[PDB]
Amino acid sequence: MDSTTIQQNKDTLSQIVVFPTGNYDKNEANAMVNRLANIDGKYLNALKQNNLKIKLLSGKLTDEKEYAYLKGVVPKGWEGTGKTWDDVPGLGGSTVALRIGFSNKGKGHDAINLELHETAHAIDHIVLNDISKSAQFKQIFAKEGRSLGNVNYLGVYPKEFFAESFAYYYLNQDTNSKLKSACPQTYSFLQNLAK
Numbered sequence: 001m002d003s004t005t006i007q008q009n010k011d012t013l014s015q016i017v018v019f020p021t022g023n024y025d026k027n028e029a030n031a032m033v034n035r036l037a038n039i040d041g042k043y044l045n046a047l048k049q050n051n052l053k054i055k056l057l058s059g060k061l062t063d064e065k066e067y068a069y070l071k072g073v074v075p076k077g078w079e080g081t082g083k084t085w086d087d088v089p090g091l092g093g094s095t096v097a098l099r100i101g102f103s104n105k106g107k108g109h110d111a112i113n114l115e116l117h118e119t120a121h122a123i124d125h126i127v128l129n130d131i132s133k134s135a136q137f138k139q140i141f142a143k144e145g146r147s148l149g150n151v152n153y154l155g156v157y158p159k160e161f162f163a164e165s166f167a168y169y170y171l172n173q174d175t176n177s178k179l180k181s182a183c184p185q186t187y188s189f190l191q192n193l194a195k
Ligand SMILES: [Zn+2]
Pocket: 117, 121, 160, 163
């Protein structure tokens, strides 16, 4: 996106993103907002319309009262790892909650970018009526769903392949080009969705 579109999307995000009370790196929180601002504005305005909040967290997910119910619960695909949601830095779906500082791949999660993956889940569910379960996307997923790797997770769960593809499409020009090369039908699907 051009600098002016980024600023417009950041203004929209000022009424979506909620910053935490506790201590955190303000510059890194701002960088996360900047990355979210690359998401197409139509989706951001629709999240705002639904009063979805992107809660940035100063600590563990399960230390927020609304996620205490996840204390000790093992995420799907994480069985046998000894890890629980207490160790997971982001969640997305009907809500979005994200630990500041944990954006990059490998910061306790496997996504190319935490905030884009989790926000993609919310866009899928809230804005797009679970499009990752649509017949069109199921056909694409059957063909391309392993082509971002993590074959036994992304290749098995279309909601996760959708969220990861969305993150690749919107993070930066490199990941956007990688998605087009590896998953051309997914790329065209996302490009058309934003038209
Ligand atoms: Zn996910």
